[PDB]
Design a protein around this nucleic acid. Structure first.
Ligand SMILES: Nc1ccn([C@H]2C[C@H](O)[C@@H](COP(=O)(O)OP(=O)(O)OP(=O)(O)O)O2)c(=O)n1
Ligand SMILES: [K+]
Ligand SMILES: [K+]
Ligand SMILES: [K+]
Ligand SMILES: [K+]
Ligand SMILES: [K+]
Ligand SMILES: [K+]
Ligand SMILES: [K+]
Ligand SMILES: [Mg+2]
Ligand SMILES: [Mg+2]
Ligand SMILES: [Mg+2]
Lengths: 432, 566
DNA sequence: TTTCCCTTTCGCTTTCAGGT
DNA sequence: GGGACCTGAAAGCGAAAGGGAAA
């Protein structure tokens, strides 16, 4: 099937400089490049495009090559809701048996058009620049680019296109990281399936026969809701750190500033706010009374209330990381909606004396969670790092490399300008 | 099979040949006919034409160039392959070595048949009365944007088998300049014999007249001995320093020898500062006596200073010195200097903290050491206590990124040698007067300022100032300065301005950026002197500005605000 | 609720060096 | 006036953002 070339916003080549790597990693890079050369997945390159690569040692002792494709993905031209007059998941007869393929279980080897191979280039540097670098380009899509939703959706559509047409009676669709094919007769289905299996194997989709699952629509639609459901979270302001006048003045400043937005009458937090009365020494002690505690619960209740029930189905999710004391805080958002809070499990926190490591571990864990809720990586991760500090982290931090493996979205430090999100950034929250 | 070009467009372009002076025209004719003889160029009937001309080599011979600007604009760029010069210091010390430079490199590498038509040109007649003769390139034209990638790829393939058969040989290859080094003279001979075969098999010729076998060698702008290395260029333009352009020339000269001869960023502060002003290259600039002391110090360092070829078996160490302006790094192997590592004179932030500069430098120099020798240093020496390193790992994000995955030793034992003694240090490495947390049992002062130029503090004593400033922020910084002057005792300070608070808390160890508002620079400078001259510590924090909450800090903040009205 | 007061941070232009 | 590709450094300036008053 002659591959269709990808759509690009611009034809201007982007070159992101490869950095020096230590010998062990240069040796691992050459080893893995040759492995891929033998499988015909890469070939030598002279491209003006370049994307950085790095290698991660598994505990096996083997290395895996990751590529940072942010710069290339940013140039992909997104396509519209193609085949929108195709059937929805709701509209199948419940008397029909359903076949369920999990695309995370599969392996993809999607051939590139001649003209697209040059854009997926990379360099292995030489020690001391003693020799020219070795350069290469992918002849098949690198696995990270499947995290672009457009690419993935388009590819599976083309892969299912002929099986769907021929099998008009069969209803075959791609629902959020699951390929479904369902027909009324069990044996009418097995025919449709085995055509599909053969057709997508031709396009480059390896299907795992062992992993395949079978079940009725009602079991599926119903379980799906329970599998991807938002975790309701009775989130609280952390109180153990609140000891001195200076602690309370800072926190009560931020509460009083956000109070109108939360719809709490001015007079209604007088018990809380009167704690400021007394000794003017910044380290003088202050304690929350039960009354003051109940007033803090009003602000917590309103913050809890902001959490949505269900995600919008078109829009992608984003991740905010805040550099809170002890350990970092994440929030999953869909643009201006708050979705859910993310933390490291509390037992594991003392294990990581590098705050950077904790940021990286949180991003990896929350990426997985976001993929569970929506079926895709977030399209942006917001970190308390400058672009230069992101660049140095990719270079030096193994934790960062693991945490941001196969990420093709935006990484930046531009936080929302909504008053609620500014208020959450200024305060420390925890979930008991 | 050789590397073909990718063309955007097939529409040929004709750029007229231009006149040449007799001497240059003869040289053009001399070289052009010789290439013909070698079969590197061929007679042309192409509707493409590019100009050709000559320039002087260092040989004294001439170079045939093709002005291929319009043709290059139609060729897809290839990716670069060698970002910066190899360092000779990594050639293992006391190792016999040979230096090879291939003869007319680009012209010995064939062009793909179909591209030759596009590199067509016109040679004028020795006589202005007689007609021109037209040729084309069958080999890499000097002037073609991809010639370098193609030449590197071609020679690299030729050297690859030499690398494989002699894995214990140090082989540097830059375009056509080639170094070979081995442990023993016998091992060098075996290495070289193999090389001659492989360059000849690829149709490349070693210039026999220009081979080096003997000290002292010259390679990629460096004088290389058995151990000692210095830049060839031992001279900076210091005589005529009247224009901007004159200082640009001198400072470019110095920059090129900085890394080997060890000039810290602070030692050039006065020279760099004179670059500031009118953008015109011909703008006047005065030499200051401070700038001259700087040139004397550079000139002494040119004569004394050097770097060293290293043992191939020993790892490197990184020394970071708390030098004035910005920290300075040295890559070293025990006592032998490899390279200096320096920070920019001008900054990004208004307030660049010395601890972040240490961390930036360690990160940048770790990558450089990794590029030189293939590993991190086994040891990083920092002008920090055990306690400060501990605090840095907890609190500094830059330090965390800087030392992420550093598996070696961090320590503060410098070599007891005298050689580094001349370097001018600072004691403003970490905050010692500026406190992270409020002081115990200390007076609390509250400051404010107004666009009407009024400034005040209040609390245990009161004062209003009429300040020259028309900014609330600038007025309040004068209040903060007066507070730091008039309370010769531990103090806590509460200000409503994030701006004033961040400036005051960060100035102690800061590099202050050279802004285009001198008035602000003078204020930040006075604030910095005020903090540094303190007898006692202080702590400054932000109160949100108009909360009208209860308590004593609101009360005093409101008193300060009233003291600076109308 | 967006739409401007600045100010500060980032990216880019334009000089100089240097290497084949 | 007159080529190509790389590296490093300097100052200045224009683009865009952060914050927090102003529309
Ligand atoms: N100003 C320069 C210097 C060099 N080069 C390129 C083309 C040359 O072919 C190659 C090597 O430069 P040399 O000085 O060795 O020139 P030749 O290859 O012509 O060597 P030789 O003079 O020994 O014949 O580098 C260039 O394009 N422009
Ligand atoms: K480029
Ligand atoms: K997927
Ligand atoms: K090569
Ligand atoms: K400066
Ligand atoms: K500032
Ligand atoms: K190059
Ligand atoms: K300048
Ligand atoms: Mg030569
Ligand atoms: Mg104030
Ligand atoms: Mg309005």
């Amino acid at each position: 099937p002659k591959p269709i070339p990808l759509t690009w916003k611009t034809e201007k080549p982007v070159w992101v400089n490869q950095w020096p790597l230590p010998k062990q990693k240069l040796e691992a890079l050459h080893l893995l490049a040759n492995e891929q050369l033998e499988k015909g997945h890469i070939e030598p390159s002279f491209s003006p495009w370049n994307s950085p690569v790095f290698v991660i040692q598994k505990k096996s002792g083997k290395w895996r090559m990751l590529t940072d494709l942010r710069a290339v993905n940013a140039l992909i031209q997104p396509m519209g809701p193609l085949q929108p007059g195709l059937p929805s998941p709701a509209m199948i007869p419940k008397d029909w048996p359903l076949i369920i393929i999990d695309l995370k279980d599969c392996f993809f080897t999607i051939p590139l058009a001649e003209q697209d191979c040059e854009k997926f280039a990379f360099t292995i540097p030489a020690i001391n620049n003693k020799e020219p670098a070795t350069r290469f380009q992918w002849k098949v899509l690198p696995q990270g680019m499947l995290n672009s939703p457009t690419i993935c959706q388009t590819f599976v559509g083309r892969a299912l296109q002929p099986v769907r047409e021929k099998f008009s009676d069969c209803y075959i669709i791609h629902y959020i990281d699951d390929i479904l094919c369902a027909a009324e007769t069990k044996d009418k289905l097995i025919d449709c399936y085995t055509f599909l299996q053969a057709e997508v194997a031709n396009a480059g989709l390896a299907i795992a026969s062992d992993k395949i699952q079978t079940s009725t629509p009602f079991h599926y639609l119903g379980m799906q809701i329970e599998n991807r459901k938002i975790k309701p979270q009775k989130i609280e302001i952390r109180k153990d750190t609140l000891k001195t006048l200076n602690d309370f003045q800072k926190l009560l400043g931020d509460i009083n500033w956000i109070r109108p937005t939360l719809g709490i009458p001015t007079y209604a937090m007088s018990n809380l706010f009167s704690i400021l009365r007394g000794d003017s020494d910044l380290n003088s002690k202050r304690i929350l009374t039960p009354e003051a505690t109940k007033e803090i619960k009003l602000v917590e209740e309103k913050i809890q209330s902001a959490q949505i029930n269900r995600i919008g189905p078109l829009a992608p999710l984003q991740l905010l990381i805040f550099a809170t004391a002890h350990s970092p805080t994440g929030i999953i958002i869909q643009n201006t909606d708050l979705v859910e809070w993310s933390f490291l499990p509390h037992s594991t926190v003392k294990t990581f004396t590098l705050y950077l490591d904790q940021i990286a571990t949180l991003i990896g864990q929350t990426r997985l969670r976001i993929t569970k809720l929506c079926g895709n990586d977030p399209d942006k991760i917001v970190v308390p790092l400058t672009k230069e500090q992101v660049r140095q982290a990719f270079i030096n931090s193994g934790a960062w490399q693991i945490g941001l493996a196969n990420f093709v979205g935006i990484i930046d430090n531009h936080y929302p300008k909504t008053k609620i999100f500014q208020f959450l950034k200024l305060t420390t929250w925890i979930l008991p | 099979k050789p590397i073909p070009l990718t063309w955007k467009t097939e529409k040929p372009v004709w750029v007229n040949q231009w006149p040449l002076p007799k001497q240059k025209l003869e040289a053009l004719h001399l070289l052009a006919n010789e290439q013909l003889e070698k079969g590197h160029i061929e007679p042309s009937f192409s509707p493409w034409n590019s100009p050709v001309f000559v320039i002087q080599k260092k040989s004294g011979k001439w170079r045939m160039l093709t002005d291929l600007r319009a043709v290059n604009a139609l060729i897809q760029p290839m990716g670069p392959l060698q970002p910066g010069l190899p360092s000779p210091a990594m050639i293992p010390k006391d190792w016999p070595l040979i230096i090879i430079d291939l003869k007319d490199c680009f012209f010995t590498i064939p062009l793909a048949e179909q591209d030759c038509e596009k590199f067509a040109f016109t040679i004028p007649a020795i006589n202005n009365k007689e007609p021109a003769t037209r040729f084309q390139w069958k080999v890499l034209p000097q002037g073609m944007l991809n010639s370098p990638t193609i030449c590197q790829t071609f020679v690299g393939r030729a050297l690859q088998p030499v690398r494989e058969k002699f894995s214990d040989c140090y082989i540097i290859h830059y375009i056509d300049d080639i170094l070979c080094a081995a442990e023993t003279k016998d091992k060098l001979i075996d290495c070289y014999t193999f090389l001659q075969a492989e360059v000849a098999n690829a149709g490349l010729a070693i210039a026999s007249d220009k081979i080096q076998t003997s000290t002292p060698f010259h390679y990629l702008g460096m004088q290389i001995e058995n151990r000692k290395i210095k830049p060839q260029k031992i001279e900076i333009r210091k005589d005529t320093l009247k224009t901007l352009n004159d200082f640009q020339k001198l400072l470019g000269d110095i920059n090129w020898i900085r890394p080997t001869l060890g000039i810290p960023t602070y030692a050039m502060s006065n020279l760099f500062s004179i670059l500031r002003g009118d953008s015109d290259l011909n703008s006047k600039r005065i030499l200051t006596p401070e700038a001259t002391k700087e040139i004397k110090l550079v000139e002494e360092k040119i004569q004394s200073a050097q770097i060293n070829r290293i043992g191939p078996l020993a790892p490197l160490q990184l020394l970071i010195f708390a030098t004035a302006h910005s920290p300075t790094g040295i890559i070293i192997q025990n006592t032998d200097l490899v390279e200096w590592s320096f920070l920019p004179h001008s900054t990004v932030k208004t307030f660049t903290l010395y601890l972040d500069q240490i961390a930036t430098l360690i990160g940048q120099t770790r990558l450089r050491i990794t590029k030189l020798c293939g590993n991190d240093p086994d040891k990083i020496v920092v002008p920090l206590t055990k306690e400060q390193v501990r605090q840095a790992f907890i609190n500094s994000g830059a330090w965390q990124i800087g030392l992420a995955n550093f598996v070696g030793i961090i320590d503060n034992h410098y070599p007891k040698t005298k050689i580094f003694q001349f370097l001018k240090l600072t004691t403003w490495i970490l905050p010692k007067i500026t406190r992270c947390e409020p002081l115990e049992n200390a007076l609390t002062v509250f400051t404010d300022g107004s666009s009407n130029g009024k400034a005040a503090y209040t609390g245990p004593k009161e004062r209003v100032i009429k300040t020259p400033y028309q900014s609330a922020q600038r007025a309040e910084l004068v209040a903060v300065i007066t507070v730091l002057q008039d309370f010769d005792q531990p103090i806590n300070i509460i200000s409503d301005s994030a701006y004033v608070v961040q400036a005051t808390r960060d100035v102690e160890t800061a590099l202050i950026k050279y802004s285009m508002d001198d008035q602000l620079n003078q204020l930040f400078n006075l604030l910095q002197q005020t903090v540094r001259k303190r007898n006692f510590p202080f702590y400054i924090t932000h109160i949100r500005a108009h909360t009208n909450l209860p308590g004593p800090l609101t009360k005093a903040n409101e008193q300060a605000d009233l003291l600076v009205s109308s």
